[PDB]
Amino acid sequence: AHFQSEIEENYEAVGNVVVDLMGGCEPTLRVGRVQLGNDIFTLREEIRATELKRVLYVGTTEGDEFPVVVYAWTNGNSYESAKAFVASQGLNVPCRIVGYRSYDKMSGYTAIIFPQGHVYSLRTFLQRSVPTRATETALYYVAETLRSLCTRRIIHCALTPDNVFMYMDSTGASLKTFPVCWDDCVDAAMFSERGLKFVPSLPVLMRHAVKEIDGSYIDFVSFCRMFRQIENNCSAMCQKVAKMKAPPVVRMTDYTNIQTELTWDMDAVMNHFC
């Protein structure tokens, strides 16, 4: 019944492979070639998620091949890969998730493989180069994705534009959103079934100022902050969301209310990025 006992038993049981790394075989992630387990990646770009004090990498699978996102967990008992897999099971995004854990359980890594399309951080869509209609389109899909997590009662707790990724397939017809660093995420239904309360030493409780994570309030405020970080804020509507005050109880319709006012224009996205 210990919080750690149940967290571990729960996330060891999810049907996603975790590859154990042997002493000496815990890579230092950086741009260039990285080998994790038997898997080789060419990391091309370093992403600095400054609000989370973390870095992430985007590259391709060994060969000029499949797009990938690679990053280290907060720690080797974060079960981040298992948390990201559970999350993937309820989103419409084509993603293969591989978890790697040091033999000493001290370090951890996640690789996520997408189909042969294009992968962009949400941050890319917030840059002042991007036309407004493309920016709004990405945020339109994010609204759907966060509304879907809200219904499932999964709270991410560390959402930023640097750790939300937009997958665009080779046709350019749509964006498919997958947030990534899930080390601190709250599966409220899972908690309730295993009889789990928050314990005072959880980075998630210290990081926010709360004694509990109850509902999607934290994720909704995260979403609103992303609107503050639009570098060419042209929309009075987007300006409105950036300054808005979060309702004390978050419901799916709070995401719907934002989504209804955003432009969906995949042609503007396609024209500027391809």
Side-chain angles (χ1 to χ4, degrees), residues 47-56 160 162-163 181:
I47 290 167
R48 301 187 333 121
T50 57
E51 172 182 309
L52 315 170
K53 296 210 181 54
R54 286 171 89 160
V55 294
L56 307 82
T160 79
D162 304 307
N163 56 304
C181 307

Side-chain angles (χ1 to χ4, degrees), residues 88-110:
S88 76
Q89 298 207 269
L91 310 165
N92 185 15
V93 47
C95 70
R96 194 173 191 160
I97 296 157
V98 177
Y100 312 87
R101 199 197 205 176
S102 61
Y103 69 119
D104 52 14
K105 292 172 174 96
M106 286 275 163
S107 310
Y109 315 74
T110 274

Side-chain angles (χ1 to χ4, degrees), residues 125 127 129-137 232 268-269 272-273:
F125 282 77
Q127 200 42 248
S129 182
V130 181
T132 313
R133 296 179 63 88
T135 302
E136 301 203 356
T137 300
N232 163 23
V269 166
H272 168 259
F273 283 104

Side-chain angles (χ1 to χ4, degrees), residues 194-213:
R194 294 204 171 249
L196 274 37
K197 356 180 219 95
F198 293 87
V199 294
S201 53
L202 275 66
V204 77
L205 304 171
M206 282 173 55
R207 173 152 189 273
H208 304 293
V210 303
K211 289 214 230 161
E212 321 98 319
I213 307 291

